[PDB]
């Protein structure tokens, strides 16, 4: 790269022919003549760096021909004549320089430049752009300086929005003055068109066009758009019109387009197209089965009964945009009462300012963390299966503050790897299952029916200062049992508080370190959590200590179950990007207690599995790729350290 002139080592003593010049025909110099110095065209150097002929390389007649064709076809508004010739720089050698001569279109006398029209552009800069574009000699002036002048003026309007304000024409030209005329258009006509498409298997959509919409009224869109007669057109006006019309929630699509009205160039006509939503939908999914005793395919009347599922959906119930989805699923429609499945979803997005309202009928199966191997070696897992109805309201407020209010009616079952219920937990002693257990539910038969209230409040003031977040975060949760039904009356409350503080045993970063070299500060994290439970709490709602997002380095419920609990944690984080290395390094120490409340639970699970009530751990770690953490943690109840790999950030 960069000036191949070591290829021109065919010097004056390395090759010889008796009567002819010897060598290869290399280009050794490119000279550009007649190129105008106007600002809208590139100068001679980057014109030189786009030719097929290169200095120090060889060429032929075809290269000169295609260079002439490309240069003539690229700048036909400004030059339209190039002649290219070569000449030998020395006898008895084939090295020869190539010169390019341009004769641009000229205009035979321009002395002054004037700008006319443009009642929006003040006189303070029209003077300076008329002063900038002046040539020196008056007599032979190139065309392209004309194209420079409007290239100022257009740009000015394009820097201020305004896509319909342009230099129309030049009307001087007989008295020696180049006079640009600026046209500024204004809005004249606002019209609205109503269309809908049609669902087929074709790739091209056909439409049904209406003069008036079925739901929305034609002047409502025009009043919402804010388009007035006698106003300039701004692009942000179109953005605001899009927002205000699309606010209603009943539109699938809308096109805003302004057109020039070519009968009168000072007018603008804006056309609006809008589409309503098609709200109805359904889906049917059937299946059959035929047994071939012989070639007869068994076409009895009690054979065309399917076993599929039905889904029915509707948006825009009750005028506003709230939607409903309904699903049935029976595996045999001649005996539908065997394994009938049912689901209902109802969503309401515009219930209240900053509030949504939802209802759902659904299922959940998860693994119970209470019945885990703590000090006894092996234990059968217990599965919590909930089925039922939940209705809630959600608010986002203060850019991230969250409030959720929920009311729940559910049926809860405890299972063991199957659809078979259990009523007690159990362990193996030698090869035999143990006896009489701690109970898993409140009714003692493994199935419960509960009505509950759930409140959740989250307050976030955390921001990422070049990574490495700073601030504080608080979370609160209340669970209340409302059933006098199989569940009990209980109240279960949890509060957690995390503070990301800048490290006080180190010098603090300044503003130029933050803004120029993009340095992240060193932080400490202080975290507390506490929880209490009053009343009859069932075993699928106990607090569990240990695991990730608890004391690290322990199994997921290794520390015992609890009625009351306290958890403390602190961490020191340094970013490695301040030293060029990727990632961030941290060190932590964590602790949690049940506050001597293991005896408070029904059946005492913390002594059945011989789990301790408290645990402390410490360790080191590296966070590398977003939120991928690699820790080395050390259990202190036992004295063993393990490596861990986790996704997502804690605290």
């Amino acid at each position: 790269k960069r000036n191949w002139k070591n290829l021109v080592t065919d010097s004056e003593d390395l090759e010889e022919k008796p009567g002819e010049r010897s060598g290869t025909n290399r280009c050794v110099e490119i000279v550009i003549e007649g190129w105008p110095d106007v600002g809208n065209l590139p100068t001679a150097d980057e014109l030189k760096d786009l030719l097929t002929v290169q200095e120090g390389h060889i060429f032929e007649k075809q290269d000169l021909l295609d260079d002439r064709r490309k240069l003539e076809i690229q700048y036909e508004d400004y030059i339209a004549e190039v002649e290219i010739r070569t000449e030998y720089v020395d006898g008895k050698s084939n090295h020869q320089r190539v010169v390019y001569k341009f004769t641009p279109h000229q205009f035979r006398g321009i002395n002054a430049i004037d700008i006319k029209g443009a009642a929006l552009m003040p006189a303070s800069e029209v003077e300076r752009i008329c002063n900038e574009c002046l040539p020196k000699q008056p007599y032979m002036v190139d065309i392209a300086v004309m194209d420079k002048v409007r290239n100022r003026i257009e740009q000015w309007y394009q820097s201020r929005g305004l896509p319909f304000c342009y230099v129309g024409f030049f009307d001087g030209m007989d008295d020696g003055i180049l006079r640009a005329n600026v046209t500024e258009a204004k809005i004249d006509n606002v019209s609205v068109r109503f269309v809908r498409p049609k669902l087929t298997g074709d790739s091209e959509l056909e439409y049904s066009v209406y003069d008036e919409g079925k739901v929305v009224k034609a002047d409502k869109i025009i009043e919402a758009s804010g388009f007035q007669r006698g106003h300039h057109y701004h692009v942000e006006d179109g953005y605001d019109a899009m927002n205000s019309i699309f606010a209603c929630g009943l539109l699938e699509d809308i096109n805003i387009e302004p057109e020039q009205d070519p009968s009168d160039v000072n007018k603008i006509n804006v056309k609006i197209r809008c589409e309503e939503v098609q709200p109805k939908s359904m889906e049917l999914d059937l299946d059959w089965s035929f047994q071939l005793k012989n070639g007869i395919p068994s076409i009895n009347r009690q054979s065309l009964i399917p076993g599929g599922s039905v889904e029915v959906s509707h948006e825009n119930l009750f005028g506003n945009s709230e939607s409903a989805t309904l699903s049935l699923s029976a595996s045999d429609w001649r005996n539908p009462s065997a394994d009938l499945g049912f689901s209902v979803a109802y969503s309401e997005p515009f219930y209240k300012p900053h509030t949504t309202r939802n209802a759902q009928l659904f299922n959940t199966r998860k693994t119970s963390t209470i019945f885990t191997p703590g000090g006894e070696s092996e234990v059968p897992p217990v599965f919590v299966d909930r089925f039922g109805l939940k209705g809630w309201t959600s608010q986002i407020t203060g850019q991230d503050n969250k409030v959720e209010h929920a009311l729940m009616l559910q049926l809860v079952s405890t299972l063991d790897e199957n659809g078979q219920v259990v009523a007690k937990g159990t362990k193996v002693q030698r090869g035999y299952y143990a006896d009489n257990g701690p109970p898993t539910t409140n009714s003692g038969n493994g199935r419960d029916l509960s009505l509950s209230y759930q409140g959740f409040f989250a307050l976030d003031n955390v921001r990422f200062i070049n990574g490495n977040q700073l601030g504080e975060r608080m979370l609160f949760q209340v669970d209340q049992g409302l059933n006098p039904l199989s569940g009990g009356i209980y109240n279960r409350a949890t509060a957690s508080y995390t503070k990301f503080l800048e490290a006080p045993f180190l010098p603090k970063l300044t503003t130029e370190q933050l803004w120029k070299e993009r340095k992240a500060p060193n932080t400490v994290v202080l975290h507390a959590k506490a929880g209490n439970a009053l009343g009859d709490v069932a075993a699928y709602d106990y607090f569990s200590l240990g695991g990730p997002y608890s004391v690290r380095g322990y199994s997921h419920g290794e520390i015992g179950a609890a009625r009351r609990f306290l958890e403390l944690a602190t961490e020191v984080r340094v970013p490695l990007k301040n030293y060029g290395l990727p990632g961030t390094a941290y060190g932590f120490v964590e602790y949690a207690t049940d506050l001597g409340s293991g005896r408070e639970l029904n059946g005492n699970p913390t002594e059945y599995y011989r789990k301790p009530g408290r645990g402390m751990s410490y360790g080191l770690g590296l966070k590398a790729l977003g939120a991928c953490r690699f820790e080395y943690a050390r259990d202190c109840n036992a004295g063993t350290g393990t490596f861990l790999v986790n996704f997502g950030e804690r605290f």
Partner: protein
């Protein structure tokens, strides 16, 4: 039964449904059949354009809703691009002057109304529920990954290469090589 000639584009779309369904047409047959019979530097990334068989398909969802925001530098706003209090759009030279000027103006360290907030799970309920629903229903109506216009595009490129190979061969043998061998003496 012989060979279908005259294949147009509707034929191709009908076949493209089958080509789409090929992946689900494979099932875990084999052990089930055994059970039923035994009883008796540079970085590599995806393309900036979408994929092959390109077609400018439709122009429907051209408009989007923007939020008028404040910017991390002061006295600037943004709805699609940043405007710099005289109505003009901000340039490369103004950005560095604004950053050097806000060195001093960020020294008070007033933290309020963060620029990028921590996003919640239920952030835009309407948008994730129903934004382009007609396009999803329209994909439920015709089951083709590829459009016919991309097929016409790729096919016409291939036919162009075939034709250009034919003129290269005819030009070579009838024009270039006789002249080259004549110039060799």
């Amino acid at each position: 039964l012989r060979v279908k000639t005259d294949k147009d584009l509707q034929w191709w779309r009908t076949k493209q449904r089958v080509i789409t369904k090929r992946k689900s047409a494979r099932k875990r047959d084999r052990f089930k059949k055994q059970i039923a019979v035994v009883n008796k530097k540079l970085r590599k990334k995806i393309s900036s354009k979408g994929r092959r068989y390109r077609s400018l398909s439709l122009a429907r969802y051209l408009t989007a809703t923007r939020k008028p925001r404040l910017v991390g530098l002061d006295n600037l706003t943004k709805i699609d691009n940043i405007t710099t209090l005289q109505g003009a759009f901000i340039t490369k030279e103004e950005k560095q002057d604004s950053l050097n000027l806000t060195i001093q103006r960020k020294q008070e360290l007033t933290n309020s109304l963060k620029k990028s907030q921590i996003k919640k799970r239920s952030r835009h309920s309407w948008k994730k529920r129903s934004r382009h629903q007609f396009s999803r229903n329209h994909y439920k109506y015709r089951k083709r990954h590829t459009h016919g216009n991309g097929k016409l595009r790729v096919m016409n490129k291939k036919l162009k290469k075939f034709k250009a190979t034919n003129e290269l061969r005819q030009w070579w043998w009838n024009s270039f090589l006789p002249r080259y061998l004549s110039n060799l003496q």
